[PDB]
């Protein structure tokens, strides 16, 4: 619909870059094709497709409309066969925005290499949860989104922290607009498990080994969250929602030009949610604010400054799971799903805020440069108190453990990169070169010396959280931890033939961890990157990649000799086929992958059964482990009103001995989510449902009162979701979500400190959205 335009005649390149900007649309185009071509003047209020055909008059070019993207091409009478993976330069460095796309499949994406590429072009497993998916299914935070992510298993630590698995591993890499955060441990990463979705366009998850742009981090995956950006036309909405257990949410999102010319633009969002829960005496208030402003210093240089903020604030938090597995005498414990071992006053409140600036420049090259500046705070305030141990006892009494952690982490980042195309042996390739620097500083206080507390409670079966609050006494410990990451990376994408694209690059990395432990250094570590994509027909391509990552170990992962273990590394080997249909409106992939891990910290039983060095009382051993598995997924349009996203993943991970590890992540999983928009008489009704299935999962846990190990099993289970929206009016709509339709009662944790958490019972959410 109609937009304000001002692009005067220039290099086709600038014109195109300037166009994507002015129109809020990603423009893809081939450097060698637009070289030495000229745009025609365009001036004023016009629809974006009249505008672009006017712009290209003279140039001999054609436009392919594809949702939030246009690709531009210049056909010849010649053409000796087609280069589907031709080097394309893009106008939006983070890829195609998903908001308003109507789709559950993404557009282009730079998650793997910083190069803007399509899921077909990307030689790695890349799953995206798109803005619309989030809207239809009510996914309001990162916990909701992960639960709907193909290939991801979400399990509980406690009411205020979950765990995310891919391919054998706990995910511990998070980025924001492509900037890695520091996530070493939970001090550094307060609120990462809790980010509200209000401020994001999409969440994009790279599976495998992602050292190339994460730098130091875990195996499994990266989770990359893209912030919502401001726009050239005014728009926004208000949303109010109401669900099971006194769950009320509201949300305001406003976007547009702040000056008559359009050269300064803004976007602002606020969202507030106060909820109780099926679990007894647990409530949680969350608040978020976000502001970003964009300044055009001139048509090819943009300055962006922004801030965001989220406060997660519960009552009735627990330390570890919702209740203890065994009682005092060693019998399995059996409780209601409402049972909550946390105390009334108990809280794991977690906060986060960012201030950021970026500057981005288009070189008259076709090259583009970008500087990214970040100040992040991850903070927490955690007076935890919760029933813990082998309780109840024969007389129905129980004991509380109560400790208090408060603290803050402040992080600063610089990220700078150059991206452009270049000719080598008569053909067009592209390159990213970039360097990065991060400094983050965790500080905190711990309280465990309680003064004159009586931690028994007389009644377990009817626990209510209604116990007194202790005197924390004086700080037991002072934390001070500084991490410093310096990175340098270079990926090159060579168009070798019309069907074959070769990827060659890597990162060089320097990582120093400093503070109250002995210094942990790693100078000059190289992380390689090898990939190739071979096109088979207009539909299918095959691909292969070899990818790496490592994480220098926590300071207490030492050995026999009191030496820190060499860093936990892994390599992903992946071969696959990916298929693209309806001009990129539908994507399919089947992959086979293998993860080789080396130096995975293992216990060391023989030593630990009777230590011989008081400096390490619990030494480890650095071992090896293997993931073998395969994954299939599909997303996009199955038919005109009909969208899906679905996947299927199979895995087993062992260590070189042979034992199955991460046995709680299931060996087989399946997700399918779908909605359908009726046409004709019912064209204002959208209907939707979904299912998630997973196979057996187990833990080995020690029954201390009976001095024997036990196996705990969660039998495979289905969860079914349902959904309907009705657009009553141009500007107002009403929705309902029903989750866990058949009220399946299942577990999300067994064995985490000898405890258990139930997943959500059936729940509903009502809401109205109002678009101005
Ligand atoms: C040192 C920290 C920097 C803080 C940066 C925070 C940025 C906050 O800015 C708020 C911007 O909100 C823009 C909202 O856009 C509203 C668009 O409508 C404009 C009014 O409409 C004009 C008449 O239709
Ligand atoms: C353990 C028990 C769980 C409860 C299960 C109940 C499931 C019942 O599902 C029925 C849902 O249908 C209700 C239809 O209500 C209409 C929605 O209208 C929205 C109003 O919008 C306001 C506009 O301003």
Q: Give the chain's end-to-end CA distance (angstroms, integer).
A: 15
Burial class from Cβ neighbours inside 10 Å (0-12, 13-18, 19+) for residue 720 reads middle
Nearest CA to ligand 1 atom 1: 355
Spatial separation of the C-alpha atoms in residues 334 and 234, rounded to whole Å: 55
Closest approach atom of ligand 2 to CA 728: 23
Q: Which residue has the tokens 């899906």?
A: 644
Cβ-contact 300, 11 below 8 angstroms: no
681 secondary structure, DSSP code: G
Kindly provide the resolution of this structure in angstroms, with one decimal: 2.9
Spatial separation of the C-alpha atoms in residues 726 and 237, rounded to whole Å: 16
Spatial separation of the C-alpha atoms in residues 685 and 663, rounded to whole Å: 42
Which whole-number Å values give the CA distances from 380 to 189, 339, 405, 408, 448, in the listed order?
9, 25, 8, 6, 17
Spatial separation of the C-alpha atoms in residues 476 and 308, rounded to whole Å: 33
Please give the angle made by the CA atoms of 739, 240 and 67, to the nearest 5 degrees. Answer: 80
DSSP calls for 392-410: --TTS-EEEEEEEEEEEEE
Spatial separation of the C-alpha atoms in residues 613 and 165, rounded to whole Å: 35
Spatial separation of the C-alpha atoms in residues 435 and 243, rounded to whole Å: 46
Query: DSSP 3-state assignment of 21?
Result: helix
- Cβ of 734 closer than 6 Å to ligand 2, yes or no, is yes
Query: Ligand 1: which of 228, 252, 291 to mutate, judged by most atoms within 8 Å of the beta carbon?
Result: 291
Q: Which two tokens stand for residue 355?
A: 């201030």
Radius of gyration of the chain (CA): 27
Cβ-contact 381, 315 below 8 angstroms: no
Cβ-contact 719, 692 below 8 angstroms: yes
- Cβ of 500 closer than 6 Å to ligand 2, yes or no, is no
Where on the phi/psi map is residue 706: left (φ > 0), alpha (ψ -120 to 50), or beta?
alpha
DSSP calls for 563-610: -B---EEEEEEEEEEEEEEGGGTEEEEEEEEEEEEEEEEE--HHHHTS
Strands 69-73 and 26-29: parallel
Query: Ligand 2: which of 278, 336, 734 to mutate, judged by most atoms within 8 Å of the beta carbon?
Result: 734
Q: Which residue has the tokens 């803007």?
A: 116
Residue 561 burial (CB count, 10 A) = 9
Give the 3-state secondary structure of 683-752. Answer: CCEEEEEEEEEECCEEEEEEEHHHCEEEEEEECCEEEEEEEEEECCCCCEEEEEEEECCCCCCCEEEECC
Domain 86-229, classified CATH 3.90.550.10, yes or no: no
Burial class from Cβ neighbours inside 10 Å (0-12, 13-18, 19+) for residue 165 reads buried
Closest approach atom of ligand 2 to CA 766: 19
Nearest CA to ligand 1 atom 5: 306
Residues with beta carbon inside 6 Å of ligand 1? 234, 254-256, 258, 266-268, 291, 293, 305-307, 355
Closest approach atom of ligand 1 to CA 255: 15
Q: Ligand 2 centre from 764 Cα, in Å?
A: 7
Ligand nearest to the CA of 373: 1
Spatial separation of the C-alpha atoms in residues 297 and 330, rounded to whole Å: 70
Where on the phi/psi map is residue 612: left (φ > 0), alpha (ψ -120 to 50), or beta?
alpha
Q: Which of 674, 594, 598 is nearest to 631 (CA)?
A: 594
Q: Ligand 2 centre from 28 Cα, in Å?
A: 44
761 secondary structure, DSSP code: P
Strands 500-515 and 540-551: unpaired
Strands 220-227 and 174-176: parallel
Residue 235 pairs in a beta bridge with: 255
Spatial separation of the C-alpha atoms in residues 203 and 176, rounded to whole Å: 9
Spatial separation of the C-alpha atoms in residues 513 and 129, rounded to whole Å: 34
Spatial separation of the C-alpha atoms in residues 301 and 294, rounded to whole Å: 11
Query: Ligand 1: which of 234, 262, 294 to mutate, judged by most atoms within 8 Å of the beta carbon?
Result: 234
Cβ-contact 303, 357 below 8 angstroms: yes
Give the 3-state secondary structure of 183-241. Answer: CCCCCCCCCCCCCEHHHEEEEEEEEECCHHHHCCCCCEEEEEEEECCCCCCCEEEEEEE
Nearest CA to ligand 1 atom 17: 256
Spatial separation of the C-alpha atoms in residues 188 and 177, rounded to whole Å: 19
Strands 642-655 and 428-447: unpaired
Closest approach atom of ligand 2 to CA 743: 1
Spatial separation of the C-alpha atoms in residues 564 and 579, rounded to whole Å: 45
Spatial separation of the C-alpha atoms in residues 540 and 581, rounded to whole Å: 9
Tell me the HSE value of 425 on the side-chain side, using a 13 A CA sphere.
Answer: 4
Handedness of CA 651, 656, 662, 666 (dihedral sign): positive
Q: Which residue has the tokens 């081939």?
A: 30
Closest approach atom of ligand 2 to CA 735: 19
Which whole-number Å values give the CA distances from 220 to 166, 171, 483, 490, 771, in the listed order?
5, 6, 22, 22, 39
Give the domain 230-772 fold. Maltoporin; Chain A (2.40.170)
- Could you name the CATH architecture of 1-85? 3-Layer(bab) Sandwich (3.55)
E strand or H helix that includes residue 132: helix 131-137
Q: Which residue has the tokens 């108190």?
A: 385
Strands 368-387 and 747-750: unpaired
Q: Ligand 2 centre from 741 Cα, in Å?
A: 13
Q: Which of 112, 78, 79 is nearest to 95 (CA)?
A: 112
Burial class from Cβ neighbours inside 10 Å (0-12, 13-18, 19+) for residue 55 reads buried
Phi and psi angles of residue 131, each rounded to the nearest 5 degrees, phi first:
-55, -40
18 secondary structure, DSSP code: H
- Cβ of 363 closer than 6 Å to ligand 2, yes or no, is no
Largest CA distance in the chain: 90
Spatial separation of the C-alpha atoms in residues 182 and 451, rounded to whole Å: 35
CA dihedral 714, 165, 187, 758 (to 10 degrees): -20
Phi and psi angles of residue 735, each rounded to the nearest 5 degrees, phi first:
-130, 160
Cβ-contact 138, 737 below 8 angstroms: yes
Handedness of CA 436, 174, 765, 683 (dihedral sign): positive
Strands 586-602 and 568-581: antiparallel
Nearest CA to ligand 2 atom 2: 762
Q: Ligand 2 centre from 736 Cα, in Å?
A: 6
Query: Ligand 2: which of 338, 722, 766, 769 to mutate, judged by most atoms within 8 Å of the beta carbon?
Result: 766
Query: Ligand 1: which of 236, 256, 308, 377 to mutate, judged by most atoms within 8 Å of the beta carbon?
Result: 256
Domain boundaries, the chain: 1-85, 86-229, 230-772
Q: Which two tokens stand for residue 402?
A: 């109560």
Spatial separation of the C-alpha atoms in residues 313 and 409, rounded to whole Å: 18
**Strand runs (DSSP E) across 258-341, as ranges?**
264-275, 283-298, 301-315, 323-324
E strand or H helix that includes residue 756: strand 755-758
12-23 and 48-55 helices, crossing angle to 10°: 170
Q: Ligand 1 centre from 298 Cα, in Å?
A: 20
- In the chain, which residues are followed by a C-to-N distance beyond 2.5 Å, i.e. a gap? none
E strand or H helix that includes residue 55: helix 48-55
């Amino acid at each position: 619909q109609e937009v304000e335009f001002d692009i005067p005649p220039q290099a086709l390149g600038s014109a195109l870059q300037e166009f994507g900007r002015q129109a809020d649309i990603q423009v893809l185009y081939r450097p060698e094709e637009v070289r030495n071509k000229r745009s025609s003047a365009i001036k004023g209020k016009l629809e974006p497709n009249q505008a672009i055909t006017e712009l290209l008059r003279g140039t001999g070019a054609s436009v392919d409309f594809q949702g939030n993207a246009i690709t531009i091409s210049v056909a010849e009478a010649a053409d000796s066969s087609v280069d589907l993976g031709a080097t394309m330069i893009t106008s939006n460095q983070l890829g195609t925005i998903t908001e308003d796309s109507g789709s559950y499949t993404p557009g282009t994406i730079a998650t793997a290499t910083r190069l803007v590429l399509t899921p077909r072009e990307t030689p790695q497993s890349i799953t995206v949860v798109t803005r619309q998916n989030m809207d239809d299914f009510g996914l309001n935070n990162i916990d909701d989104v992960m639960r709907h992510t193909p290939g991801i298993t979400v399990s509980a630590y406690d009411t205020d922290r979950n765990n995310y698995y891919a391919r054998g591993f706990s995910i511990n890499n998070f980025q924001y607009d492509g900037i890695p955060s520091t996530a070493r441990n939970v001090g550094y990463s307060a609120g990462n498990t809790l980010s509200d979705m209000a401020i994001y366009d999409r969440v994009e998850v790279l599976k495998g080994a992602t050292g190339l742009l994460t730098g130091a981090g875990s195996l499994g995956a990266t989770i990359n969250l893209i912030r919502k950006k401001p726009t050239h036309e005014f728009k926004g909405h208000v949303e109010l929602g109401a669900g099971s257990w006194d769950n009320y949410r509201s949300e305001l999102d406003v976007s547009g030009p702040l000056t008559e010319s359009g050269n300064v633009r803004g976007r602002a969002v606020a969202a507030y949610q106060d909820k109780h829960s099926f679990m007894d005496h647990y409530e949680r208030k969350t608040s978020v604010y976000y502001g970003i402003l964009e300044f055009d210093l001139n048509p090819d240089t943009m300055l962006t400054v922004g801030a965001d903020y989220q406060d997660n604030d519960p009552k009735g938090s627990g330390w570890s799971g919702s209740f203890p597995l065994f009682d005092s005498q060693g019998n399995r414990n059996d409780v209601s799903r409402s049972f909550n071992n946390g105390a009334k006053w108990s809280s794991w409140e977690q906060y986060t805020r960012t201030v950021f600036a970026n500057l981005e420049h288009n070189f008259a090259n076709g090259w583009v440069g970008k500087v990214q500046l970040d100040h992040k705070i991850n903070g927490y305030h955690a007076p935890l108190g919760a029933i813990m141990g082998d309780w109840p006892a024969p007389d129905n009494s129980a004991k509380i453990v109560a400790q208090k952690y408060t603290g803050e982490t402040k992080s600063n980042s610089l990220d700078i990169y150059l991206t452009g195309p270049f000719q080598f042996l008569g053909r067009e390739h592209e390159l990213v070169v970039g360097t990065s620097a991060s400094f983050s500083h965790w500080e905190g206080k711990s309280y465990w010396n309680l003064r004159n507390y009586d931690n028994t409670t007389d009644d377990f079966i009817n626990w209510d959280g209604d116990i007194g609050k202790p005197d924390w006494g004086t700080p037991s410990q002072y934390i001070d931890d500084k991490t410093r990451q310096l990175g340098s990376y270079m990926t090159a994408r060579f168009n070798v033939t019309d069907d074959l694209n070769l990827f060659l690059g890597g990162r060089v990395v320097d990582y120093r961890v400093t503070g109250l432990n002995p210094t942990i250094r790693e100078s000059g570590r190289f992380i390689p990157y090898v990939g190739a994509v071979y096109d088979l027909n207009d539909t299918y391509s095959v691909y292969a990649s070899y990818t790496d990552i490592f994480m220098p170990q926590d300071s207490w992962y030492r050995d026999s000799s009191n030496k820190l273990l060499e860093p936990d590394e892994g390599q992903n080997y992946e071969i696959g086929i990916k298929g693209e249909y309806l001009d990129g409106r539908l994507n399919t992939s089947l992959a086979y992958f293998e993860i080789h891990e080396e130096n995975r910290a293992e216990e060391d039983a023989l030593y630990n059964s009777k230590p011989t060095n008081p400096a390490i009382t619990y030494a480890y051993k650095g071992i090896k482990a293997k993931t073998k598995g395969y994954e299939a997924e599909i997303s996009g349009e199955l038919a005109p009103g009909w969208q899906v996203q679905a996947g299927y993943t199979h895995k087993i991970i062992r260590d070189d001995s042979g034992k199955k590890v991460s046995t709680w992540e299931p060996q087989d999983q399946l997700s399918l989510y779908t909605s359908y928009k009726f046409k004709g008489a019912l064209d204002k009704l959208t209907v939707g449902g979904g299912a998630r299935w997973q196979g057996k999962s187990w833990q080995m846990v020690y029954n201390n009162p009976r001095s024997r190990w036990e196996k705990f099993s969660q039998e495979d289970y289905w969860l079914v979701d349902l959904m309907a929206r009705y657009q009553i009016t141009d500007k107002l709509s009403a929705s309902v979500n029903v989750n866990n339709v058949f009220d399946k009662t299942y577990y999300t944790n067994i064995g985490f400190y000898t405890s258990a958490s139930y997943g959500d019972p059936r729940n509903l959410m009502f809401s109205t959205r109002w678009d101005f």
